[PDB]
Scaffold this active site. Structure first.
Site, PDB file in Angstrom:
ATOM      1  N   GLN A 158      12.327  -5.406   9.515  1.00  0.00           N
ATOM      2  CA  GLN A 158      12.529  -4.329   8.528  1.00  0.00           C
ATOM      3  C   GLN A 158      11.272  -3.445   8.349  1.00  0.00           C
ATOM      4  O   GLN A 158      11.327  -2.414   7.674  1.00  0.00           O
ATOM      5  CB  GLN A 158      12.917  -4.928   7.165  1.00  0.00           C
ATOM      6  CG  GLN A 158      11.815  -5.793   6.581  1.00  0.00           C
ATOM      7  CD  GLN A 158      12.129  -6.367   5.222  1.00  0.00           C
ATOM      8  OE1 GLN A 158      11.958  -5.711   4.170  1.00  0.00           O
ATOM      9  NE2 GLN A 158      12.617  -7.587   5.227  1.00  0.00           N
ATOM     10  N   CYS A 202      15.233  -5.311   2.995  1.00  0.00           N
ATOM     11  CA  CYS A 202      15.768  -6.645   3.252  1.00  0.00           C
ATOM     12  C   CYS A 202      17.206  -6.858   2.762  1.00  0.00           C
ATOM     13  O   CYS A 202      17.972  -7.568   3.413  1.00  0.00           O
ATOM     14  CB  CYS A 202      14.897  -7.685   2.574  1.00  0.00           C
ATOM     15  SG  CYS A 202      14.699  -7.723   0.820  1.00  0.00           S
ATOM     16  N   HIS A 212      13.125 -11.542  -2.353  1.00  0.00           N
ATOM     17  CA  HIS A 212      13.470 -11.206  -0.968  1.00  0.00           C
ATOM     18  C   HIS A 212      14.878 -11.667  -0.586  1.00  0.00           C
ATOM     19  O   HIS A 212      15.275 -12.764  -0.937  1.00  0.00           O
ATOM     20  CB  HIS A 212      12.409 -11.872  -0.075  1.00  0.00           C
ATOM     21  CG  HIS A 212      12.530 -11.555   1.378  1.00  0.00           C
ATOM     22  ND1 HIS A 212      12.699 -10.270   1.845  1.00  0.00           N
ATOM     23  CD2 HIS A 212      12.476 -12.350   2.474  1.00  0.00           C
ATOM     24  CE1 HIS A 212      12.747 -10.285   3.163  1.00  0.00           C
ATOM     25  NE2 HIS A 212      12.613 -11.536   3.568  1.00  0.00           N
ATOM     26  N   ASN A 229      15.415 -14.549   8.897  1.00  0.00           N
ATOM     27  CA  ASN A 229      14.552 -13.609   8.177  1.00  0.00           C
ATOM     28  C   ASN A 229      14.579 -12.318   8.979  1.00  0.00           C
ATOM     29  O   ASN A 229      15.080 -12.291  10.104  1.00  0.00           O
ATOM     30  CB  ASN A 229      13.101 -14.141   8.043  1.00  0.00           C
ATOM     31  CG  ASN A 229      12.311 -13.453   6.926  1.00  0.00           C
ATOM     32  OD1 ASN A 229      12.800 -12.520   6.288  1.00  0.00           O
ATOM     33  ND2 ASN A 229      11.073 -13.914   6.690  1.00  0.00           N
TER      34      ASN A 229
END
Lengths: 212, 84
Positions: free
Chosen positions: A19, A25, A159, A175
């Site tokens: 990202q 995110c 997050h 992730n």
């Protein structure tokens, strides 16, 4: 539910993304779950546009943060385009969904996993990839090199990521920080510690797309 | 709370000092780091620190907003933005 689940082995997860400097995110997280449910329901694995959600989710704040749930509601309402037709730029621009042509995929709804419940989360992960949140600001999380992570970390989530599997002692997370972080971009976070917040507050807020 | 949103230290102090030195290097500037007045952090790919910093510019105190992008696992630290 099964003892081990790993959607990557079922061909339901695309390559790890990055990202960059943008606080996007929430869009990446949403997208992983859409790529997953679509593979599960149609047999095809495709890549969808995080940028589209970044530009078009008026409830979120572009690169200043956002919400996986409103992004998922957006896909249920208007569908989403392929990532290659609407590529990631790392900055918010104006919504150009209608400039592209028909959507590539559309969902039928959004459901939330009961929070602070490890079993409910695993149950849902067994069914499909799930958007989850956690506190990633801590240095240990930032430096994660592999293994089953236990922190330390608080529960002030900041997050959004995606749970794509689990095992007896961990939940498998994709992730969005490139493959150079963690285990080629993934993290195994310890489960089963009797902490209802979940390690790093992992059980705080989980959503998944519904596709008839 | 916004995931990836901006929310309100020894490390932070050095990042503020880093922002000013980095800015002086790039712009041949002579800003004197005076103090970190306020700090906020945001999770991105890594961490984006939104630092409000007081410097001395030509004998006069001035406050700047610096954004320092840290990706610890890559040993990377970048001055992303710097302005009054």
């Amino acid at each position: 539910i099964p003892e081990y689940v790993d959607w990557r082995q079922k061909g339901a997860v695309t390559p790890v993304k990055n990202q960059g400097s943008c606080g996007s995110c929430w869009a990446f997280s949403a997208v992983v779950t859409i790529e997953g449910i679509i593979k599960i329901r149609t047999g095809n694995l495709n890549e969808y546009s995080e940028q589209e959600l970044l530009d078009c989710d008026r409830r979120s704040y572009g690169c200043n943060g956002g919400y996986p749930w409103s992004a998922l509601q957006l896909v249920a309402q208007y569908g989403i385009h392929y990532r290659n037709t609407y590529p990631y730029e790392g900055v918010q621009r104006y919504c150009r969904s209608r400039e592209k042509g028909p959507y590539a995929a559309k969902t039928d709804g959004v459901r939330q996993v009961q929070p602070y419940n490890e079993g409910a989360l695993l149950y849902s992960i067994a069914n499909q990839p799930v958007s989850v949140v956690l506190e990633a600001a801590g240095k240990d999380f930032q430096l994660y090199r592999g293994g089953i992570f236990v922190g330390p970390c608080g529960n002030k989530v900041d997050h959004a990521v995606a749970a794509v599997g689990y095992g007896p002692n961990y939940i498998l997370i994709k992730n969005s920080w490139g493959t150079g972080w963690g285990e080629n971009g993934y993290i195994r976070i310890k489960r089963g510690t009797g902490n209802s917040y979940g390690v790093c507050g992992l059980y705080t807020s989980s959503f998944y797309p519904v596709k008839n | 709370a916004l995931m990836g949103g901006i929310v309100d230290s020894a490390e932070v102090e050095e990042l503020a000092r880093f922002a000013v030195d980095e800015h002086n290097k790039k712009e041949n500037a002579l800003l004197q780091f005076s103090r970190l007045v306020k700090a906020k952090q945001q999770v991105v790919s890594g961490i984006m620190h939104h630092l409000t910093v007081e410097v001395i510019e030509g004998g006069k105190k001035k406050v700047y907003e610096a954004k320092v992008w840290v990706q610890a696992w890559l040993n990377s630290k970048k001055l992303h933005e710097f302005s009054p």
